[PDB]
Write a structure and sequence with these properties.
The PDB classes it as oxidoreductase. The complex is a heterotetramer, with two copies of chain A (about 325 residues) and two copies of chain B (about 350 residues). Chain A has about 325 residues and is an alpha/beta fold. Chain A contains 13 helices and 14 strands. Chain A folds into two domains: about 190 residues, Rossmann fold (3-Layer(aba) Sandwich), CATH 3.40.50.970; about 130 residues, Rossmann fold (3-Layer(aba) Sandwich). A six-stranded mixed β-sheet of chain B has the order 2-9-10-6-5-4, with helices on both faces. In chain B, α4 packs across α11 and α5 runs parallel beside α6. The chains are: A alpha/beta (about 325), B alpha/beta (about 350). Bound molecules: thiamine diphosphate (2 copies), potassium ion (2 copies) and magnesium ion (2 copies).
């Protein structure tokens, strides 16, 4: 019905939840008067004021901890990390203070909080600013982890994230913020919600299952477009949730295609693809495989600066196509 | 036959960026005195019992005791409302009780039984109660949390405050300073409290902190140093600090000078870094229960036999709770996965291998 | 002969490296006068003094960064984290300041540093004190990660760790510290070194390959002894190194046994076993696998306190045997 | 005709826990003045060139410019020895040059070429040189590192010191306070330096810090506030702090009050949180190069014609360097995996898929 960028979709989601529940509030570095480091929170401070949209000092462990305490007390904070690379300084509060508390308290202390911000590779930001944290967070019990790709994913997941009464990590993508998508009236509604824990088939297919999350989803669709011209039909699956991942949807797809390729932007060892592949081998879909499942990931090095090096440190469409052809043996 | 109340003189607090501090005189009623006495004694006997149960292998893992610091948890409670909030570290058995939990529920949690306040899922370091947020095992992590609870108090506008406790060892944690800055910046009704018992596990304050004046580490945040062995000093300083925050003046730091009779925890005899004589001297001259007792009797607020009767009832209370905690069954294995998430539909959690499944209900 | 505990083996290793090079030094909470939180550094302060064995305040991010700086300046620091649960507060210094620097600097600035301490589950320490970080650290390029099981492992790996000129994470185990093992003359030598990146076959077998690391290795050997009485011979492989893992040794074994089971104490999703299972499927040994590889891990929940609950949150010998029989259909 | 030296007055530094501070007068020789002028002007033209290249997309990602702050990198260098050490954050182009690298190696790194000082592997934020440790991208992370470099100086007994720089925004990082404590505890020859250019990205100091007296945040550590726009003032304070540290008195804080002409980085226009009139007022009244130039001409240490000739030589050096930086080839793809580990035999690293292998040599 209309063109909406991922950035604007997230903004709509937050704006709507703030209007709906007075207990919701946003805090982080440059989220208010600066209109957001990547302009995701633009206009919110002007509309809601100092009490609801809070600019913070550069003290990650501290404001993440404050956010968790406010949640324990009954509020529903949205804690933004400029990039998740910086969340490493505050990762103890996310894991030991937020994720484990409901369980440790025997179901007495819930923690309704959301941690969001860009994750993974960007453009020429080098090693300390290009790390993907999907596998790290998805590894921890008591936490829910999502990684939206397009505008619909973004709005639907942030709203659901905010209404959930447990800690939810929303791993966004800086390169996706400015990408426009066709936004249907259903997504425009203030009641639009995407369930956490359910994957989405972005393209129906019969020759091979291609699973991914975040930005790479777009490259998988591009790869599918190219392969389609050669008679190869790819079923592209958008994970949406990292924890708890929707393995049922992936297994059902493999039972039809007999082939699987995983695509992620993060480092290979102990990554997202590793878990999917291990789950496939432990599940009922293993016998439906006609070829071993293979993984497309970022190169196993800290992210280099030079253009040509960075380009070969992140999965390209040609790398996705190459792996798919190896799997189908064509 | 007994005086209804009496006036007592209390030590003046050292001040940091404060024009005036709490009064140096306070009135104690016979009713309150008897109450604080029973409370401190209950905590003391509970810790001694936990020590006994630990040696008997009934309690496992960590077990940090607070005997010697009873004037702190009871004094702080006496100076705040049931609707105010409090959070501390792992040496929290006393606070759990003063905040409303029974000795039975506390000991049952230590022995890891279903009747524990946390259903046996948390143990010694993790216990929660109404407006009591633990009970936190990561040194320093509870400070930003406390400032967050203070943020909610201001946000709700009910005039409630939050007491955020941390030890001298934790005082050197970077996140505490990040919390000082934001609390001052936003004038949060947070009472930062440093429980100074002189040692951080095995490291004395002199060897861990370049400056041992904890009540001033906040720098721009005002503070006061209190005698943490005198319950009336603690109560009065607490009323002052709470009133300060309720008036909208922002955060304040309060240093409680106390002492712990036991080692850091059960596995630490506590004599490799300090002498037995030092411990004995403190007990002999500054024990919190001894101090209040002498005040009660010397002022005719109560009789020695009356206080002895309370000791007997308290000892009886602890023995009954200990029997309950030792006989109460362990939680059922079928509930191992319960309470991972709140307000969600039930789901399955994986065990030691893919063929082991546990049900998880909110 | 000579029998030595794991704790003693580690102490021997550090002591020998300290004597060998005056630039080597140890720092951490209670490492000096307290003789070590778990007594691993016992006697070292008395022998070397305040300059070589440094007690620190409780400031993880701070002393970890100080250690990294000292290493960049030419010293060879051994940084101790009381438990790795506490390394989360300083994980940014380990990853962004140490691991990635040699690469980012174009090979100009090396970081010869060692990060050690107990990792994983203990006995009754609850949720915030039982986390395993093998998967988290082994995920990062620029780091080397080892996880010793017995006394030989411990001594040889700590010495190799100290002599390496890059950041090395040594994930120890508190429950293993007090366990004694026969210490051969070879290991007694001050020249005893275990190469990082090479696994060790602890037991030869022909029916199935059982890979593990740290404490569970002992449980696998126990499981193998029981199965041996039934006619089943397990080839137990002690990883020793988490990154870079010795997949070659594992593949060679699977090519002989046709079966594989991985055993680990940490959380299942995105864990150590996931990477091993994914590599086996992508490698030359996949065609030799007669049954899918299965994983034995800790339960997917924050660690509970109650004895019976904790017993069922970590892998037991019976769980290893069950998985093995399920794999061999017996 | 030219004076060989002249005396100048410099602003007295505000002091924290110090009886006496740096002198309020100093001597500048003609030779030193000529060197400082050329150095600051080289940094200025290099940054302006960097700006131009970025707009042309020749430089990517981050690019934090330090123009306006030249009295800091040159003044700091003028007050230490080449054998001393220094570490800072990401706004490090100036420091990389003052520490010894050529404009050629710096620009080639920014343009991501083989001849870059880091071989095109690091870019704008990660550059290293002899006794210069970056060039660090995580706010505050470099402070503990500097303290560690200082520990090494003491450990090896070399009589060298380490300057550890961080911005006003970074001053609220918890790890900085953890470092203050240990540095004072072990009397490390560490000079903590807060470059205060008034804004943390887009947040003014008044909105980010409860207390804006950065030189006093060290609390127990002494400090001095310095005019960061005056090259001589910075040099004098630096010589004072370095001497303080070499004497074995431990750490000291130095707040340099400066200003950045450009926004936080290339994508920040720099006018949403401050007015254009504020920026220009600072430039016309306090530009570091203008101030030195006026001093040298007035005192007859150099002629306006001589200084102009230096500008011409510098401009050409910059242009010849930019030509090399834009013509120099990118690093070969075959070396993508090089330098992952030091002193190790060669090995293979995985690329985007299992069939892509890169060789890795130390
Ligand atoms: C971040 C972190 N580092 C280290 C530890 C280990 N530890 C637990 S208690 C403790 C001593 C803290 O002493 P203090 O804050 O003075 O409190 P006390 O027990 O004396 O009340 C230490 C080092 C921890 N739990 N968390
Ligand atoms: C831990 C962390 N948090 C946030 C960021 C994002 N960031 C990079 S520079 C910056 C501003 C720092 O300002 P300041 O310390 O004053 O230095 P300046 O650039 O003004 O010299 C911020 C918020 C980061 N790199 N690291
Ligand atoms: K939530
Ligand atoms: K090393
Ligand atoms: Mg203490
Ligand atoms: Mg600044």
């Amino acid at each position: 019905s209309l063109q909406v960028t991922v950035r604007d979709a997230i903004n709509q989601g937050m704006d709507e939840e703030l209007e709906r529940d007075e207990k919701v509030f946003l805090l982080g570095e440059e989220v208010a008067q600066y209109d957001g480091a990547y302009k995701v929170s633009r206009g919110l401070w002007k509309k809601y004021g100092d009490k609801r949209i809070i600019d913070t000092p550069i003290s990650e462990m501290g404001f993440a901890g404050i956010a968790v305490g406010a949640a324990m007390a009954g509020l529903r904070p949205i804690c933004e990390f400029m990039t998740f690379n910086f969340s490493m300084q505050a990762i103890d509060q996310v894991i030991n203070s937020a994720a484990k508390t409901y369980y440790m308290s025997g179901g007495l202390q819930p923690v309704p909080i959301v941690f969001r911000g860009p994750n993974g590779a960007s453009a020429g930001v080098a090693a300390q600013h290009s790390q993907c944290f999907a596998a790290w967070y998805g590894h921890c019990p008591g936490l829910k982890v999502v990684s939206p790709w397009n505008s619909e994913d973004a709005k639907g997941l942030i709203k659901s994230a905010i209404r959930d009464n447990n800690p939810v990590v929303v791993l966004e993508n800086e390169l996706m913020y400015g990408v426009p998508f066709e936004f249907p009236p259903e997504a425009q509604s203030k009641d639009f919600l995407i369930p956490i824990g359910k994957a989405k088939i972005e393209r129906q297919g019969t020759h091979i299952t291609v699973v991914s999350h975040s930005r790479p989803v777009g490259h998988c669709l591009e790869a599918a477009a190219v392969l389609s011209k050669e008679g190869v039909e790819c079923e592209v699956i958008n994970m949406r949730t990292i924890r708890p991942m929707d393995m049922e949807t992936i297994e059902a797809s493999v039972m039809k295609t007999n082939h699987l390729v995983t695509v992620e932007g993060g480092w290979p060892q102990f990554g997202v693809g590793a878990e999917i592949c291990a789950r496939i081998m432990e599940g009922p879909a293993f016998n439906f495989l006609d070829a071993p499942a293979v993984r497309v990931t970022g190169a196993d090095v800290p992210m280099p600066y030079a253009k040509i090096l960075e380009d070969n440190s992140i999965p390209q469409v040609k790398d996705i196509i190459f792996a798919i052809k190896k799997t189908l043996n064509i | 036959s007994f005086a209804n109340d009496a006036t007592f003189e209390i030590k003046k607090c050292d001040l940091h960026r404060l024009e005036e501090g709490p009064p140096v005189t306070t009135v104690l009623t016979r009713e309150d005195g008897l109450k604080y006495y029973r409370m401190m004694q209950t905590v003391r006997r509970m810790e001694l019992k936990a020590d006994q149960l630990y040696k008997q292998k009934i309690i496992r893992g960590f077990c940090h005791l607070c005997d010697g610091q009873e004037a702190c948890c009871v004094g702080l409670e006496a100076g705040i409302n049931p609707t105010d909030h409090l959070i501390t570290a792992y040496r929290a058995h006393g606070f759990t009780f003063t905040r409303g939990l029974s000795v039975r529920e506390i000991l049952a949690e230590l022995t890891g039984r279903k009747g524990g306040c946390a259903k046996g899922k948390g143990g010694s370091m993790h216990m929660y109660a109404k407006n009591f947020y633990g009970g936190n095992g990561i040194v320093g992590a509870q400070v930003p949390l406390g400032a967050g609870i203070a943020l909610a108090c201001k946000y709700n506008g009910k005039d409630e405050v939050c007491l955020t406790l941390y030890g001298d060892g934790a005082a050197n944690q970077g996140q505490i300073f990040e919390a000082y800055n934001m609390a001052a910046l936003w004038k949060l009704p947070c009472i930062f409290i440093c429980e100074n018992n002189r040692y951080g596990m095995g490291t004395s304050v002199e060897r861990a902190a370049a400056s041992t004046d904890y009540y001033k580490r906040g720098d721009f945040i005002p503070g006061l140093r209190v005698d943490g062995m005198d319950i009336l000093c603690v109560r009065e300083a607490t009323r002052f600090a709470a009133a300060y925050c309720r008036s909208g003046k922002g955060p304040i730091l309060m240093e409680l000078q106390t002492y712990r009779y036991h080692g850091h925890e059960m596995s630490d005899p506590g004599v490799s870094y300090r002498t037995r004589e030092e411990i004995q001297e403190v007990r002999s001259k500054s024990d919190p229960i001894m101090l209040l007792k002498d005040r009660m009797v010397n002022s005719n607020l109560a009789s020695v036999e009356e206080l002895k009767e309370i000791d007997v009832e308290v000892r009886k209370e602890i023995e009954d709770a200990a029997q309950f905690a030792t006989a109460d069954p362990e939680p059922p294995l079928e509930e191992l996965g319960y309470h991972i998430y709140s307000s969600d539909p039930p789901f399955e959690v994986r065990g030691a291998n893919q063929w082991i499944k546990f049900k998880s209900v909110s």
